[PDB]
Design an enzyme around this catalytic site. Structure first.
Site, PDB file in Angstrom:
ATOM      1  CG  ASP A 114      -0.098  -0.043   2.550  1.00 49.51           C
ATOM      2  OD1 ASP A 114      -0.822  -0.355   3.545  1.00 49.51           O
ATOM      3  OD2 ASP A 114       1.038   0.427   2.552  1.00 49.51           O
ATOM      4  NE  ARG A 135      -0.591   3.187   3.919  1.00 53.37           N
ATOM      5  CZ  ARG A 135      -1.946   2.498   4.017  1.00 53.37           C
ATOM      6  NH1 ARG A 135      -2.774   2.578   2.959  1.00 53.37           N
ATOM      7  NH2 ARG A 135      -2.263   1.622   5.336  1.00 53.37           N
ATOM      8  CG  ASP A 162      -3.346  -1.551   7.322  1.00 52.03           C
ATOM      9  OD1 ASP A 162      -2.275  -1.090   6.825  1.00 52.03           O
ATOM     10  OD2 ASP A 162      -3.429  -2.147   8.296  1.00 52.03           O
ATOM     11  CB  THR A 163      -1.061  -4.077   2.288  1.00 55.25           C
ATOM     12  OG1 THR A 163      -0.496  -3.240   2.326  1.00 55.25           O
ATOM     13  CG2 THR A 163      -2.162  -3.801   1.073  1.00 55.25           C
ATOM     14  CD  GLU A 167       4.281  -2.940   8.688  1.00 58.25           C
ATOM     15  OE1 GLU A 167       3.076  -2.044   8.917  1.00 58.25           O
ATOM     16  OE2 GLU A 167       5.376  -2.693   7.992  1.00 58.25           O
ATOM     17  NE  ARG A 215       2.655   7.011   4.537  1.00 60.22           N
ATOM     18  CZ  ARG A 215       2.166   6.104   5.335  1.00 60.22           C
ATOM     19  NH1 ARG A 215       2.736   4.820   5.000  1.00 60.22           N
ATOM     20  NH2 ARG A 215       1.267   5.970   6.386  1.00 60.22           N
TER      21      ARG A 215
END
Ligand SMILES: Cc1cn([C@H]2C[C@H](OP(=O)(O)O)[C@@H](COP(=O)(O)O)O2)c(=O)[nH]c1=O
Ligand SMILES: [Ca+2]
Length: 132
Positions: free
Chosen positions: A15, A29, A34-35, A37, A78
């Protein structure tokens, strides 16, 4: 909202990307997702999500970024956008595969929230990846 051109410099993970935007290198971003971690002290599907985003955006003819209606950057500097690879939104593609969850939903940057939640619901019904 509108789509603006940008050039991939480097895919970082599922992401987060390094992008040339208006002639300057920036980190972007993906909004609303949310991908898993793979960086901060490696979550299941993180490597898969990274590979999916890398492949999707490296193989694109044309990459675009679409800001939402509010902040265009986060506290880490970002860019915050929906990012499109040949017209296909990467944020939705990841969600539809169960490689990202809908997350970090901060108003007023929520224009595509219901669209993404519908894809997440399908990925869940289909028991894909994170939902398996
Ligand atoms: C996607 C997104 C993330 N963020 C911040 C929230 C999280 O801050 P904290 O790190 O302080 O928790 C972090 C999640 O990003 P990552 O998932 O890349 O870690 O980025 C925003 O502020 N706005 C956004 O729209
Ligand atoms: Ca993440």
């Amino acid at each position: 909202l509108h789509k603006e051109p940008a050039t991939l410099i480097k895919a970082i993970d599922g992401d987060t990307l390094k992008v040339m935007y208006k002639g300057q290198p920036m980190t972007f971003r993906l909004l609303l997702v949310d991908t898993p971690e793979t960086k901060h002290p490696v979550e299941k599907y993180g490597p898969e999500a990274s590979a999916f985003t890398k492949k999707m955006i490296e193989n694109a003819k044309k990459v675009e970024v679409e800001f939402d209606k509010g902040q265009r950057t986060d506290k880490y500097g970002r860019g915050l956008a929906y990012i499109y690879a040949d017209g296909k939104m990467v944020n939705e593609a990841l969600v539809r595969q169960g490689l990202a969850k809908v997350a970090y939903v901060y108003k007023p940057n929520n224009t595509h929230e219901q669209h993404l939640r519908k894809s997440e619901a399908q990925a869940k019904k289909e028991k894909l990846n994170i939902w398996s």
